[PDB]
């Protein structure tokens, strides 16, 4: 029988009526890597961690392919007004730190 | 004074409060609830129980017709048959040949055992909530009477005045219609004690158990007596509370949820647990002390020893204080992270005290106030070795609890990265669009 | 008896009345009765005065 934390009563026979309840022990360990966290709380919430982690890990690719969107925005137009005209003088600054393509001709 | 607050509907777990009237001592109060009792209003339909039925004499004529007169009586039933030649002890009973009437009439009637073992019909309505309160204050020892939960009526109990709040739910484990047979009660559907179906559990309906009149139906259908033979025999559908009585299902004592036990007498419904029970206390103005002649504490530290996420009374702590006279005042947390297992200390001149607390957190943050005075606490805890215990916990579970110290970095970091992640991202198509425009002009 | 289900012999016929297809009554929750007459009033419910 699953017992949960709410508690569970069972009669057997004519013996009076007998109530148990669950604690909070577990198996795994909070404090600890990352495959021991992730461990403990599919024990205690087996039924919210496969959704956060699945929030998380949607959260996160969407946050990844929209930043990358605005990033090569910006980094094409560093270069298309400076690769149109290869005579101007692309500046040491723009070379690497500001934009990934480096100074040539 | 006057102090109101609202207690949880929990029958083992005390409730414990500091009243705070200004200029005077605080007092420590314990309300604790001993029962909980719903009792709804009933008005009683009908019983049943088996049949019982009984044949009179049938009549025997030599040779002759008569026929039977209507009878006001429970499925009464006549039929004459004609050119029986019975027989008896001692010859032939009638002389007239191939011309006989037997009558046999019949009629169903109660039982002798209807007056011990019978189902009861009854329609309930909402009715009143009766509850018993443990009453504790400062030096006065425990007084225990029964209340009314109703926001209306008082209850005076030692030289204090409770005035129990109505239940913040309506909820009860009772149908519109019950059915009370002997120990354990049913929830279950009348047919209105004009119908029947012979053989299910209406054959037999009766308003009371010494009532006059009633109701059956039962196919009673007398048959041909053979071979010249003084008897009347019948054939009937069998009892339907007999075939009711294997045919039914789990009493509503075995079914109801929040653990109600259902008692009998009034047909209450003792010791639920749901919603939440508002109170209103008159504590006497004799029990207060003044201000002035109290300790007062200073200089207080807390360090938690030992702490543990088990149900009951989980926690060691040591408090260092330092205090201008010896005397007793008590401590409470008035926070719904951790219980107090003790109500009072006995204080010395800059000594030490031990308290007893449970809690579900595994950082503890809780506070507590010792003299008019307060001290933070804070302290890790270990999962408990035990699986499964039989008391239920001293303690509620909030919703971050179980949510420990690395398992909030990692909700940080996982939150603050991405966000500054698309922040970089939107700073940066600002920082062309300027540059752009500085290179138009 | 006005519901659906219960029938009455009247004579030999059989009559079934049925339910009222109005579920008004002129009864408040609470009722005062002194005498002959009933008024629809409220309580103090045992406990104030």
């Given at each position: 029988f699953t017992v949960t934390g709410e508690g569970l009563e069972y009669t057997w026979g004519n013996h009076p009526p007998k109530r148990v309840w669950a604690q909070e022990?577990?198996?795994?360990?909070?404090?600890?890597?990352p495959h021991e966290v992730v461990v403990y709380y599919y024990n205690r919430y087996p039924l919210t961690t496969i959704i956060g982690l699945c929030t998380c890990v949607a959260i996160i690719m969407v946050s990844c392919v929209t930043s990358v969107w605005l990033l090569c925005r910006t980094r094409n137009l560093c270069i298309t007004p400076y690769k149109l005209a290869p005579n101007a003088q692309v500046p040491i600054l723009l070379?690497?730190?500001?934009?990934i393509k480096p100074t040539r001709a | 004074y006057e102090h109101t607050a609202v207690m949880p509907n929990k029958v083992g777990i005390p409730y414990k409060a500091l009243v705070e009237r200004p200029g005077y001592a605080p007092v420590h109060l314990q309300i604790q609830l001993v029962n909980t009792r719903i009792i709804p209003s009933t008005n009683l339909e009908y019983i049943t129980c088996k049949y019982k039925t009984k044949v009179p004499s049938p009549v025997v004529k030599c040779c002759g017709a008569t026929q039977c007169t209507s009878k006001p009586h429970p499925d009464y039933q006549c039929q004459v048959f004609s050119g029986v030649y019975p027989f008896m002890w001692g010859?032939?009973?009638?002389?007239?040949?191939?011309e006989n009437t037997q009558m046999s009439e019949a009629y169903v009637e109660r039982s002798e055992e209807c007056s011990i073992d019978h189902a009861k019909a009854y329609k309930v309505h909402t009715g009143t909530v009766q509850a018993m309160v443990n009453i504790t204050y400062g030096s006065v020892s425990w007084r225990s009477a029964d209340v009314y939960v109703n926001g209306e009526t008082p209850a005076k109990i030692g030289d204090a005045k409770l005035i129990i709040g109505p239940l913040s739910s309506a909820w009860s484990?009772?149908?519109?219609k019950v059915v009370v047979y002997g120990h354990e009660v049913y929830n279950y559907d009348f047919p209105?004690?004009?119908?029947?179906?012979?053989?299910?559990?209406?054959d037999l309906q009766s308003r009371?158990?010494?009532?006059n009149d009633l109701y059956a139906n039962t196919n009673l259908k007398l048959q041909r007596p053979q071979a010249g033979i003084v008897h009347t025999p019948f054939t009937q559908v069998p009892s339907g509370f007999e075939r009711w009585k294997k045919d039914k299902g789990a009493p509503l004592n075995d079914v109801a949820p929040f653990g109600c036990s259902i008692a009998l007498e009034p047909l209450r419904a003792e010791n639920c647990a749901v919603g939440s029970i508002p109170i209103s206390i008159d504590i006497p103005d004799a029990a207060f002390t003044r201000i002035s002649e109290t300790p007062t504490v200073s200089d207080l530290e807390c360090k938690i020893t030992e702490c543990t996420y088990?149900?009951?009374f989980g926690g060691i702590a040591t408090v260092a204080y330092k205090s201008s006279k010896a005397g007793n005042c008590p401590i409470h947390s008035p926070s719904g992270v951790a219980v107090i297992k003790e109500n009072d200390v006995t204080l010395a001149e800059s000594g030490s005290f031990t308290f007893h607390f449970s809690t579900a957190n595994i950082h503890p943050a809780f506070k507590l106030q010792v003299c008019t005075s307060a001290v933070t606490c804070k302290g890790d805890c270990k999962p408990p070795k035990?699986?499964?215990?039989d008391y239920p916990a001293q303690h509620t579970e909030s919703?971050?609890?179980?949510?420990?110290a690395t398992a909030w970095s990692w909700i940080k970091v996982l939150v603050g990265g991405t966000s500054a992640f698309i922040v970089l991202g939107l700073i940066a198509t600002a920082v062309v669009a300027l540059v752009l425009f500085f290179h138009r002009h």
């Open positions: 022990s577990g198996e795994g360990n909070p404090h600890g890597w070379a690497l730190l500001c934009c | 010859g032939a009973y009638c002389f007239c040949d191939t484990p009772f149908d519109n209105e004690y004009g119908t029947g179906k012979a053989g299910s559990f209406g009371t158990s010494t009532s088990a149900f009951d035990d699986h499964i215990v919703f971050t609890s179980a949510i420990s």
